[PDB]
Ligand binder design. Structure first.
Ligand code: NAG
Ligand code: NAG
Ligand code: NAG
Lengths: 71, 492, 492, 71, 492, 71
């Protein structure tokens, strides 16, 4: 059923391809898609930063991952 | 009985005095109403449709491209234009190429280039949406009495009456032959949430596909394809199926993205289907909380005599029903009509009839009758029809059938059952409190968490659970309660 | 009903005893008066104008320059003069140039030079101001009774009466057909603050512009353009559109600053427009606190019979009104006139009419009637018109409509509502105290902070808030209260 | 020469105006105009935050003002 | 001498051995080259132009609107479309109105509405830009020798030779009559930075305006107006002059923003003007570093006799020159040609000539001659022309003239002088180090701080100065040096 | 809509310009414009000087800025 994407291989190239920027930036529009639809949850993850962990180096390690985990 | 055909079935009791019953007629179900002194009825929701509803955004799943026209200019010679940069249904993209002396320009650098194609749509590749006007939707409830006959699915039962329910109906008195009358009050407003339901329709003439679907509103209005409305000649966002390659300084190649039917069909993983019949757009998943009045009913054949105890035989032997009940069919040969002497004792030589009947007062008529349904207690039982005794071992348990209904009752509490505490009748501090304790909680976690999916619900709940493990305040350590909700409530 | 046409609408109740109602008829609104035993009325402010008012300072937005005359002298040879250094509408500037032997002077240094041009004004480029004489201003209040008919905006209603209100009017008794009479007492003095309102007018014959505007007095009298009055031949401060270049020792160039219409139109960011119709100078934003007497009203058709319960149909189905009410239109076919048996039960099989009507005593006449407006409680409701039942789900909530009016009431309290506590009637320790506690505060922060704008109010309040953080005296630490005012009060 | 803006007065309004949002947001596109043209200076004002003042409440009082001061 | 006409003038010395002089011929200036043994020359930049250059983005300052077409739909009846939502030069805006029964819709809520107008442009209201192709730009340097004649600005001097300088010119040998030849090598590449210069042009036929302007590239390409190119029929971003009012549910009003000439002319505060003459697009501000060879020059009339000491008179008496020099004109009546015995003693009856001449070897010709320019020391002086003595008091001071040139030299170091250390010739550790110590600093604070203006430079420098007052590290307390730069360097 | 001013660029000049003094002094007639219209607020900012801060070096840093912030 499911065909996996071929951003795994990425052999070579100086000719022509399909989507140079959209191989990376569709993953940067899903994440921006999560924010504008869930503003109540985008502010809910601010409670992680200044209240729970207080571990600045590893605060960002929770923020970036949990947004990327939501597909 | 139609309730004997399908798997899903619910029994509703009623004592002497219980005359108003509030049901939740969910589609693809069947409810058997049992009341002491009343003939037992089978009430189900049959169909939900609307003839020729209003249609919202269409889509195009396969772009039909034609008339590729490309213009380009030398890097300081007035950036390129075309006549088709304004016409309707035309996708255009401007870009800067690399003009040399090979393509005859005085200077080098970045020369302008632009291409335009006519973005039509392929025939029968439209994802036509449809929505339900609440003023014109037609619910359909059918009621069949337990006549003592049996009618298979290929056949049509005689006394099966049908009552439509638009917005413009209050109550329908149904003439149920000689059993009396029944009144049905259907809350047509509080049925399927018609504001958040779109009937998606592809090419319905295709053989090996469902004719239609039933998608959420927020999902359907946030697709990323070309779209228009009825009567509109030209498309909107038509560039979402057309991609342009980087030009080689004179021509910029235009690439279609082909058919998109396969991507759409994979996106509907776990969507309830919907049927289209001619002009009627049916549904195959829905519910309505109709209320049944029972005061105008009466049993049929109480004035009849008892049958001869000898003259019973079998058209069909007794067997299990798959609902912890027993079904059978006798055949009588003496004088008709008469009442069938049905009883069943468990084990004591007790002369104690423990056959809680489902079809009350089983009577052979002049042209029918014999189908008898009963519920027996667990253990060894001997079923009597006059002088016609059969061993039976009821396969259930004492707590087995109570644990059966709670397994039903939890799976009753799906999103249908999130609305439906009203399957009983006037619970007060039992059921009316159930509506209060669930709407303020279920509605709260539908506003948030509504349209996020199984996997984040199984993740974000564990994340808020993990914050319960490492929390400063014991007062704020009650965020562990969300692990009691988010891992459990919206995971079934 | 005119109140059903537009968005903004306010309902005013009245009990047995409530006969004098004090409204605040704000322009671009509509007020529905409801009183027990009285026919419900729709009273709104229609127009505010004055035929040919007095006009203050004009302006010139595009200077018409002609007759450039330049004279110059050698550096010790008697500084230059001209005949046009005194005449009206002539801009002149003296300067010291650098005279050489190229331009034939005996010595060097700084020779005098002066240029003069005739500063006229271009046709139809005048920013003519206008002000309102309170003795000649004409308010206009129209009152429409709920007749049970319906009249669209293209059409004109029959019983819609119109009453003008100059300063020389105390009370107007309006013959409302057969419903009785109504008395309107309009405080024409306490309406729009006419002292601080100037009607700005450009070329009104221009197609794609508003015909006029409505600017504050202090803004209009402090522009930096050329200005005059009516009948004045020559301008004042005419150098504000004319700039002179540094001379090249014989000629000093005179530079116009072109049209100034674009700068003026950008300066009116957030200004309410005003319409000019012939000679009348209307407004499109204003209010007046008229008081309505209700003692001379009576319902129409209490002596009529009830209609036949069978013979009702629909010209138009029931639907939501956008003001948490329900509107509809029936059609009767029997004998006329008669009273329409309108009722609506929620859900108890209760026979309890919970349809709080807006149009009281709905009656079909010999040539009209049928439009019925009602307000239903939240939840499932069944609307009855005789034997004609319709399901309805009122989309509001219990606290939802209370939270609706407070969202209205806060946005009622704009600068209109800064004046308007008087939307009720004789509150005493409720509303008359509201006038006291707000005029001494609102008037105080209108004298200061009046003509400063959003951004300094959002800045100076934070500045006085920041002084609350670093303050010596705890007694003087109550300057934090201004953060409770300046960040909140004058920021809506 | 100069005509001042009439966001000062602001009498009333339930009819029609010019630009409800652009009375405020033209002042919010000037400031966004300063950033995208002066990215090297936008990062230069980060040196105020974590290095010089270290006075979190009054760090923002320098950042917001100096951006608004540039017209 | 042309250098005697205008204010700005620079003298360049040259010793025995100095034959190659590198000038910086700034426009609107004049340089007098003086060399021992050579006749003194006046070299200036005359004009910078290009006949019919390429034109970039035009603009529209006054939108011409016509054909308002508005369509609207009821709130669930297929959102509104128009044929003019695609055609060229048409501004359209979609909006949601409030449809009632007044405008005949079945439901309420938010009905779609859209309006479209044809956005043309008014005649002669275009802000046409123009740019300079470096391959076709024409510098123009004129050289006039000090012939001893005088020619005013209305008149044209005989020996004034003119040499054009395109990119395709290396060196031009000019026949200067009998004074010899002069060689000019102009770095046409390193003149005005033509990459960042756009000639703005409005309607040039308007009387009281400059014909053109000279704006920065980054400013001109970041305007927020409608724009197109040459030959383009229809505009881009045409909605930037058209604003739409909130609709009243059937019509949405379309409002023009009028002329925008006034906003544009105020935006050019401190922009150097530019002249258009026919097809030639001149500049009035610029510079070029031409190098002057002096090896092929010789004084004229060394073979002539001395004049009679008696026969001198005056056409024009001696007077001040405004550059701390003295100018005069004698008239001779004897035999011509002959050399004029010019000398001047200060005060001692010393017979010590202190008249540092500017015109070397003053000679009366057969048809002209007599104009003599000299520089005298401060104090009482007696000027001799043969036997013709005149008292003179030189108004300067000893340190006054040194302090004069440094006041010149600082104002030489404008953005012209930021480029121009090369006004001398091969300084090595004087001038070539000056290029090194300034380009790496001036170029650094042009990349940053380039396009910020006077007021932020006078603010951000003080802000970085204030951080010097409150700084932790004494090593990092050297941010006070920026107060020594930002408050001083880029504030002139 | 908005055209920004070109006091930003300021290339060169020994010929002729528009307004040498009024590039700076229109910003000095706005500020004088704020005072004569708001005399009650001009005296209100005297309360900052001798009462609240008492920090002579930084008293002026509030006075000059808040007048320039009002456009
Ligand atoms: C009932 O089903 C059987 C299946 O064999 C079939 O023979 C019969 O025709 C069906 N009856 C009807 C009425 O279709
Ligand atoms: C009523 O409105 C409709 C809108 O289509 C219009 O056709 C008609 O002319 C209007 N009636 C009158 C009398 O203006
Ligand atoms: C140039 O010479 C003519 C000849 O008489 C004289 O009239 C004129 O004044 C001179 N031009 C100027 C600009 O002074």
């Amino acid at each position: 059923v499911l065909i996996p994407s071929h951003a795994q291989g990425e052999l070579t190239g100086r000719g022509h391809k399909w989507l140079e920027g959209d191989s990376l930036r569709t993953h940067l529009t899903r994440v921006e898609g999560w924010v504008w639809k869930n503003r109540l949850l985008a502010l809910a993850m601010v409670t992680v930063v200044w209240l729970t962990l207080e571990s600045v180096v590893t605060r960002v390690a929770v923020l970036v991952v949990l947004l990327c985990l939501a597909p | 009985s139609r309730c004997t055909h399908l798997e899903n079935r619910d029994f509703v009791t009623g004592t002497q005095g219980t005359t108003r019953v509030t049901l939740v007629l969910e589609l693809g179900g069947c409810v058997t109403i049992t009341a002491e002194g009343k003939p037992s009825m089978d009430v189900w929701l049959d169909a939900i449709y609307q003839e020729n509803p209003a249609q919202t955004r269409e889509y195009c799943l396969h772009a039909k491209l034609s008339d590729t026209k490309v213009a380009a200019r030398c890097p300081t010679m007035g950036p390129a234009t075309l006549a088709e940069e304004h016409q309707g249904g035309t996708v255009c993209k401007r870009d800067q190429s690399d003009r040399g002396w090979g393509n005859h320009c005085g200077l080098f650098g970045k020369g302008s280039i632009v291409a335009c194609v006519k973005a039509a749509c392929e025939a029968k590749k439209k994802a036509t949406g449809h929505v339900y006007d609440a003023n014109k939707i037609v619910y359909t409830v059918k009621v069949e009495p337990h006549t003592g006959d049996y009618v298979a699915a290929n056949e049509t039962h005689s006394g099966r009456k049908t009552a439509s329910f638009t917005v413009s109906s209050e109550k329908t008195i149904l003439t149920m032959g000689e059993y009396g009358d029944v009144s049905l009050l259907c809350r047509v407003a509080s049925g399927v949430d018609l504001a958040q339901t779109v009937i998606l329709e592809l090419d319905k003439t295709v053989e090996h596909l469902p004719t239609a679907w039933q998608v959420h509103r927020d999902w359907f209005n946030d697709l990323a394809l070309p779209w228009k409305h009825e009567g509109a000649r030209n498309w909107n966002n038509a560039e979402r199926l057309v991609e342009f390659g980087a030009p080689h300084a004179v021509k910029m190649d235009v690439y279609n993205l082909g058919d998109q039917t396969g991507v759409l069909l994979k996106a509907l993983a776990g969507v309830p289907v919907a049927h289209i019949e001619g002009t009627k757009y049916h549904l195959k998943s829905g519910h309505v909380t109709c209320e049944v009045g029972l005061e105008k009913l009466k049993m049929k054949g109480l004035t009849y005599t008892m049958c001869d105890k000898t003259k019973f035989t079998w058209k069909r032997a007794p067997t299990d029903s798959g609902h912890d009940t027993v079904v059978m069919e006798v055949t009588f040969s003496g004088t008709k009509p008469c009442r069938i002497p049905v009883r069943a004792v468990a084990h004591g030589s007790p002369d104690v009839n423990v056959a809680m009947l489902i079809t009350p007062n089983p009577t052979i008529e002049n042209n029918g009758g014999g189908f008898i349904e009963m519920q027996l207690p667990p253990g060894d039982n001997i079923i009597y029809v006059g002088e016609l005794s059969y061993q039976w071992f009821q396969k259930g348990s004492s707590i087995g059938r109570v644990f059966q209904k709670t397994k039903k009752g939890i799976e009753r509490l799906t999103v249908i059952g999130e609305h439906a505490w009203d399957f009983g009748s006037a619970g007060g501090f039992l059921s009316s409190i159930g509506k209060a304790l669930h709407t303020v909680l279920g509605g709260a976690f539908n506003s948030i968490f509504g349209g996020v999916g199984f996997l984040p619900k199984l993740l974000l709940g564990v994340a808020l659970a993990w914050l319960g493990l490492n929390m400063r305040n014991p007062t704020m350590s009650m965020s562990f309660l969300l692990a009691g909700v988010l891992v459990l409530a919206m995971t079934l």
